[PDB]
RNA sequence: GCGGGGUGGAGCAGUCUGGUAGCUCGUCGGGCUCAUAACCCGAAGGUCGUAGGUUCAAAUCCUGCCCCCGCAAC
RNA sequence: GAGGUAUG
RNA sequence: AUAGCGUGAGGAAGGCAGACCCAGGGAACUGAAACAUCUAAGUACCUGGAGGAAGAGAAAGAAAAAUCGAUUUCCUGAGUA
RNA sequence: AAGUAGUUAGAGCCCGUUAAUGGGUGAUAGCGUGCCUUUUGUAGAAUGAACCGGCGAGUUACGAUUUGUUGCAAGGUUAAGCGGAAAAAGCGGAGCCGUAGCGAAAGCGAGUCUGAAUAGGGCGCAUAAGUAACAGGUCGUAGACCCGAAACCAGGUGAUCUACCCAUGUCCAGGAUGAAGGUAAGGUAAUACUUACUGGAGGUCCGAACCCACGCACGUUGAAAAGUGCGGGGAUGAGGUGUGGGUAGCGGAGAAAUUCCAAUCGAACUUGGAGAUAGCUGGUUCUCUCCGAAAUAGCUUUAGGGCUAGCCUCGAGGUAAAGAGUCAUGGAGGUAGAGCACUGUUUGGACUAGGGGCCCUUCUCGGGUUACCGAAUUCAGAUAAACUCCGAAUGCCAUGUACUUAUACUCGGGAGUCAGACUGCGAGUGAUAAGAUCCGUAGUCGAAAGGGAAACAGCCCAGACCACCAGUUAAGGUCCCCAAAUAUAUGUUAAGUGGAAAAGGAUGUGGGGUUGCUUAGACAACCAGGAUGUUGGCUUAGAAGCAGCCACCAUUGAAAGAGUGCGUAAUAGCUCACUGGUCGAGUGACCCCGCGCCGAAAAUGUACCGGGGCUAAACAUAUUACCGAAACUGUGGAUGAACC
RNA sequence: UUAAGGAACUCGGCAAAAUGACCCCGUAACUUCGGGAGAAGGGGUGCUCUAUUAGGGUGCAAGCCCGAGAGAGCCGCAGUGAAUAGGCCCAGGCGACUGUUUAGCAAAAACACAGGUCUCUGCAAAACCGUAAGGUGACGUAUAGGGGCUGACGCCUGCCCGGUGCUGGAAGGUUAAGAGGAGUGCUUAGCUUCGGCGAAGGUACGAAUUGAAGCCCCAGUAAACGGCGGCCGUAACUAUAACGGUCCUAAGGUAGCGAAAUUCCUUGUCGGGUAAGUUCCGACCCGCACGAAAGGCGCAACGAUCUGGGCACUGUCUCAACGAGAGACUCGGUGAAAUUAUAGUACCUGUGAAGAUGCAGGUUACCCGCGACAGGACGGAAAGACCCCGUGGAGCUUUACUGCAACCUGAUAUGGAAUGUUUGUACCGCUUGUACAGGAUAGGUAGGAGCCGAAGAGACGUGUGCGCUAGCAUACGAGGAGGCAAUGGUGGGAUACUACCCUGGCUGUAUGACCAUUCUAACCCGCCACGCUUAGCGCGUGGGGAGACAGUGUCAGGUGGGCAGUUUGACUGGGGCGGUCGCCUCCUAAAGAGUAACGGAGGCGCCCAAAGGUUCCCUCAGAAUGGAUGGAAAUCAUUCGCAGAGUGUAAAGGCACAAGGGAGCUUGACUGCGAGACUGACAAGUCGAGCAGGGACGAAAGUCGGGCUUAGUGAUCCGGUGGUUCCGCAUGGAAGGGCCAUCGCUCAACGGAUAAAAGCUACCCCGGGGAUAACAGGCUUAUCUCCCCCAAGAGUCCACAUCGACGGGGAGGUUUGGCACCUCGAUGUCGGCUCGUCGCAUCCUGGGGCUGUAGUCGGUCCCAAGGGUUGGGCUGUUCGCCCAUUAAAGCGGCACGCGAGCUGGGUUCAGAACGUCGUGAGACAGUUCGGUCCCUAUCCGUCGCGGGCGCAGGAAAUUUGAGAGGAGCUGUCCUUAGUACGAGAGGACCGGGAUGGACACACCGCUGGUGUACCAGUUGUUCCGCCAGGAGCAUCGCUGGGUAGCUAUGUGUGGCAG
């Protein structure tokens, strides 16, 4: 869920607000790209933590 | 576009592990009652969204489509 | 005789 | 009685040559084209002891059908095992 | 009068030399965007340098390998050490290399290992030159080419700044407010309680000194490495300050900000390990001569690094001369194209299993069936990177004795390269865009000067050893800038097209090809008629030549359509078609070719031929001269390889 | 200092102005009853006389100081006359407060605070520093001390203990070192024949059993970490749901508050305030995503806090003017710096590493300077801090990896004496022995035919014990000899009795473990008395206390970000996400081979004991009919049929004289190898006739070293297994190794870094790069804007007045984008201010054509760039909405013009906080508060001023005018004429004239401003010796005026007519 949350954030990082101007928005494209990168890094860190949880197996319900 | 799901009327399982249709509420009928409810007695109602596949056989395994709830996009 | 100890 | 205290006879204390050696303690940078075993390295550095040298040293040894005869240093063995 | 500052031509002026086709200056004319670095590419609006001078970067030891030289040669050589002048011999043969290899080894031995093998094959021998020393090249270990990190570790120095604290001192003008408490009067049964007075509390108020630092301005190569001025907060308290002291970096102090620990703090300063390491950038100093790349493959914790190969150079080899080019001949191959013989996509037609409906019915069983669809089947015709019955050119493999020509291969030493750029051709991605990107192919640049494209890496022509006040030529050009034709002949163009841009529009202009009418009279104008039954016949407020629907004939006449449009309630009127008179020669319709026009507009200043300016100095066709390069030649010099 | 206005400025009332002192009157909501409060709002202040004053202080008195009201007057614009000395009010958020904080960008809503709460701690406290001693704590003692959280006060603080931590438990499971030492190998004295067997001892390795804490487990615990849900339906209907059902939960958010320091949509809606309000106040509640000690809600006082409004005040502004002084300027003296390749350093257009002082072509331009401005020199400074890269670094975090301290725990040594429980082991005794069938309570082996017994048998009676609840044994009373077996049957087995056993159970002994209690002599005492000794250290002596515990050492397990060292991929039309990474097949791939891309399509990580080998045999798909279930299509007959089938599996190639299908026999799915080729960097992969060995099939020829072919896989290193005429560190062995065969890799990031590895950085750093991004430029032009072709149609009709579908073509280079070509040894960003300039695709004015143009007004289109093209509210804002005007309120280019010209609100520097995501460090084109914009102008250029020379003599004046700049705008009213036109409503063209706005120029006579060497008034104090008159300083002291000069807001004129 947090991973979806950071995906939403990352997609928003690079779409400028209505309040902005073209020329003004164009100046922070790169820093917003790096914010986006940081979000993606958070995502990959979450995936690593999920791996570190393990492949816990559902218990066996004998038929 | 990404997730959940689609199984009698409602909500939920059952799927992963192919042969098994289930729990609660409800519905219909007959009793009790002056009558309704509650209670007691029985019964019905699902081909598991859909079209095709695999299999001896599919709710169940594979594929495409169509719908609903969320989240995004817009 | 007094005092007390489900619905219409 | 010992502790302690006092007296006397000796002795030490400290320094250096930013060198050489003996011990105690002991890194990391680096290299491995990361890195942790490993390396760098028992190096640098601290400290203690010294002496003109120190250390080692007179086989509980090295070796092999043949024996050699205390230690040390050099050449080789060898960049071999 | 601009001009990488000179150069080449060159007057005039002035001097007189290492005397030699001399010196200094230079009006003027032509040409001309520094050096270095890194780059596909730099005048570069990329980097570096103020200038001048000095210093400042491949070295030494030891080892490996190879080349050359010398000595001995199946042998060669000594190391330490004795000796001795910090010598030279002599001694020293221990050891090292080579002479025999093969095998994991035992072991066998010109053979050996594998293997059952006597087979074959691997490695060797056959097929015999090494060794010691010197020098050159390179490699390795060492800082190893020079400079350069941020950081790490170890030993110490620092709390005279600053944080916190310890003890001891000291400072806070003046004013204001008026807590608790207390006393007295009133009040009460007694308390409450009220009023006054007293009192002097407070992280209290106001406000200087003191401390701080909120705002603004100025300063900002400052008066000052944090201040100045004007205002501002606290100012008896969690106060300010002095003196002396403590806490020390794997740490301490923190009313806590990553704050402070001597102008240094996400871990001080100094010294040492230490020339850390740096696949990174920068730099790396004299000359000429010969040859001369690459920006690719593959692998890579790899992508701006490296390694091997491909490409360069040097040397030596070997010959059944193997290279390159063309000719001939023989072959693989399935592209372009073409085709439909399969597979897909598809158009039209024939025809239909089947589905939907109207239904007749009816246990909706089966029919009437519907063009409402319709699997398929079949006929003709289209289409294809991942379709092919077919199938080239080229390119490739080879053969040859053909005919030219100059390499190719092998071994060894030494590298550098692994960012590539445009252009043309073929394909992708892309948008059939990009100076985009990615392959293939060839070329140029890179690493290439020169002539032409105005200027211009990458286009066109073409390859600079040197000199020459010689010649012929290429591309491109010949009126002037600007060298050479105001060239020759025939035509086109009228826009400055040339010297920009589309669909599309257009009686532009020229040339062809057709076709109709026509001196028994065309076209064009002018004039006259243009009728009638019926107003065709319905509708409507209208339709009555000319809203719509259908019907679309007849009469006379030279002609007239049951009328081509404007218009009306429809009339009406304007008019058309058609007819005749007048006139007197070409006239109207199409298709193609060429050259032009409109479409067509942008931002400092004409500004889309380099400019002037050209109507030929443009375009097409053909031709003849000339200019024009560092090309080629001529003349003379220097030089490399091969052969003489 | 300023006319008039007065916040229109602006991010914002920044700054400035205004207030200001003493006395008096008077003073609100609210309030924690202290305050608010100097609230606010207003008045008076001078001098003289009454006045040695009423009255006070002092004093023996004389005298000397303080000076209360009042009247009566005097003068000024003004009487704290100067200087010094609060601006106030309303509303709101936050934090209660005073205080502290990032020395040198942040003063705050952050820290602290008192207060609350949890928690721990019995004193040699806990916690901390340190190796330890020793100390703080504390010279204290649970009303004390440490840590965590919250943050005055008021009302309150809800549910959840499933997880995670913390506490406690104590039965079991798992769990070490150590203890134990069953056994196994090797060795060999002998035994054996070779092979081999093998005692003792030594040696290598070692199983059982034992073995703590922790963990698993159970309770509890939330002011501990933390968490606080969905779906369907339901009211007489319109909506919604008080109500019901059901899943999941550990439990599903209580109060209170709420577009919030939190609300995206969102400038939400409504209301208020304003002409106009993205801000503000109050309410609403779809709370994207409040919420109860990460505290909730509220709140007086406080605040250099943030926010909104108002009164006053003002040069903030409309829109600037004057004055003073300091620089600047000239003279004299003295005398740097950053920088610098050399320089004789123009403009346009273009080209060019795509933005030229220096190139080209044109145009301008005499030489040398001075003062001023800053467009450019991609100017200077600072080897970009953004971005990317580097197998670079530091700091931080954690359930990344590996470790370390520290603690907990156990064994063992220091370190011994008893007693006792509970198990264990061995021995003596005594009881124990039931499947079934069978007389019935059969343990086994053997003997066994007789055996026991009056010195006490069977049987009877009683109790006790067992137990299969049948009965067995055991003792006790009487009694006194009799019983049972053999035999038979039952059965695996026989009964009597005898012995040796086994299985348990009990007593007794003897050994040997664990645990507990006690003792005391080791050790310890941060207890006392004494002594050394003037000593709160130490040591000794005597008591007292703990005591085999503690502590220390060695070993071992656990916990362990408290501390440490490190890791945390590459390609990539920037990086990142997504995807991919190795092998096979096609297309691309351009007819040999090869050939790239984040180019288009698919597959693989197997299977088959027949799906192989051979020998023999035959041949498919599909259609046409004929036919019973049976049909579109099962199976059958005939015909057609080069393959339209199948080929284990993707595709390509190939195959019907099989490589496709059956059957038989079999295992060549063999061992050794292999001339030679393919491919190829290497590693490797591929094909291979044939030789030998020994076989299978077939009569034989001959074929067969897997499958029609092409994928089906992974190095070494290290281990394991089997085998071997190999080695075996003195010899014999052995261990250990080699050699051959084989095994163990989603080492799939597949030529594999290590056995073993994730993250934050907004506190950051270094080396590099325009090889690589963000701004700007350049190329392109899908898009964007603009223009047009066609013309169905709309428009009573009528395509083309005005629009114009389906489709089509272009221009431009303002948008979104693509490319990555200059610049990373610095090319500064949005918005605004100053200044503008250019284009035209013209907004207004001007001219005109068409009109579905009556007139007025208008629509559309052509020519035109001369001039003009507003001021405010909200927001940082461009944009946009609104108010009000205008003739009109143009679109765009210039590094979306302009930061060596200014601002610096926003943003993305460090602080802090909200909500949210994260265990966390931390982060968010989510928000909020707060926050350092350096430079002395060399050259060109620009604006002005001079010097030099020339202009064929040297001078003085006046001048033509090439050429060049400037200006160029426009409304309203009257009239024409209420004429034309119109049914009316309405209402012109053209023309004539008057008066204005904005703008420019000039000037100061007027209105005003300024006027620091003019005049006056006046305060305090010093001086001129005193009075008087004057002077100095106090912003020129303040104040009232004001000359010249300068000047606008004032006046004159202008753009007329052409
Ligand atoms: K000695
Ligand atoms: K051989
Ligand atoms: K210092
Ligand atoms: K709300
Ligand atoms: K400038
Ligand atoms: K840059
Ligand atoms: K500028
Ligand atoms: Mg089923
Ligand atoms: Mg009732
Ligand atoms: Mg390393
Ligand atoms: Mg320049
Ligand atoms: Mg420089
Ligand atoms: Mg120099
Ligand atoms: Mg010190
Ligand atoms: Mg105070
Ligand atoms: Mg105060
Ligand atoms: Mg001050
Ligand atoms: Mg104060
Ligand atoms: Mg002081
Ligand atoms: Mg001090
Ligand atoms: Mg911080
Ligand atoms: Mg070192
Ligand atoms: Mg260095
Ligand atoms: Mg050459
Ligand atoms: Mg083709
Ligand atoms: Mg093809
Ligand atoms: Mg390119
Ligand atoms: Mg090419
Ligand atoms: Mg190069
Ligand atoms: Mg050239
Ligand atoms: Mg040229
Ligand atoms: Mg060049
Ligand atoms: Mg040449
Ligand atoms: Mg010639
Ligand atoms: Mg000429
Ligand atoms: Mg030549
Ligand atoms: Mg004023
Ligand atoms: Mg005034
Ligand atoms: Mg305003
Ligand atoms: Mg404004
Ligand atoms: Mg202010
Ligand atoms: Mg505060
Ligand atoms: Mg500060
Ligand atoms: Mg500050
Ligand atoms: Mg507290
Ligand atoms: Mg202690
Ligand atoms: Mg707090
Ligand atoms: Mg526990
Ligand atoms: Mg604001
Ligand atoms: Mg709570
Ligand atoms: Mg304060
Ligand atoms: Mg000056
Ligand atoms: Mg740099
Ligand atoms: Mg760490
Ligand atoms: Mg390291
Ligand atoms: Mg990368
Ligand atoms: Mg090919
Ligand atoms: Mg041995
Ligand atoms: Mg790889
Ligand atoms: Mg922050
Ligand atoms: Mg850097
Ligand atoms: Mg670039
Ligand atoms: Mg760009
Ligand atoms: Mg640029
Ligand atoms: Mg520079
Ligand atoms: Mg610069
Ligand atoms: Mg126009
Ligand atoms: Mg605002
Ligand atoms: Mg505004
Ligand atoms: Mg700009
Ligand atoms: Mg700006
Ligand atoms: Mg500049
Ligand atoms: Mg700001
Ligand atoms: Mg932010
Ligand atoms: Mg801000
Ligand atoms: Mg200046
Ligand atoms: Mg100057
Ligand atoms: Mg005047
Ligand atoms: Mg005076
Ligand atoms: Mg006087
Ligand atoms: Mg004075």
Could you say which DSSP state residue A59 is in? P
**Structure token pair of residue A22:** 């073209």
Residues in contact with A34: Cβ distance below 8 Å, sequence separation at least 6, in sequence order: none
Asked whether strand F has any atom less than 7 Å from the CB of A23, the reply is: yes
Say how many Å lie between the CA of residue A10 and the centre of ligand 69.
34
CA of A61 to C1' of F657 (A): 64
- Resolution in angstroms comes to 2.9
Q: Which residue has the tokens 């928003």?
A: A12
Residues in contact with A36: Cβ distance below 8 Å, sequence separation at least 6, in sequence order: A10, A13, A14
> How much helix, strand and coil, in percent to the nearest 5, is found in chain A?
65, 0, 35
CA of A55 to C1' of F650 (A): 33
Name the structure determination technique: cryo-EM
């Amino acid at each position: 869920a947090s991973q979806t949350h950071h995906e939403i954030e990352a997609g928003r990082i690079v779409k400028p607000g209505k309040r902005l101007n073209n020329k003004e928005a164009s100046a922070f494209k790169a820093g917003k790209g790096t914010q986006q990168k940081k979000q993606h890094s958070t995502i990959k860190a979450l995936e690593k933590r999920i791996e570190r949880l393990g492949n816990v197996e559902k218990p066996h319900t004998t038929k």
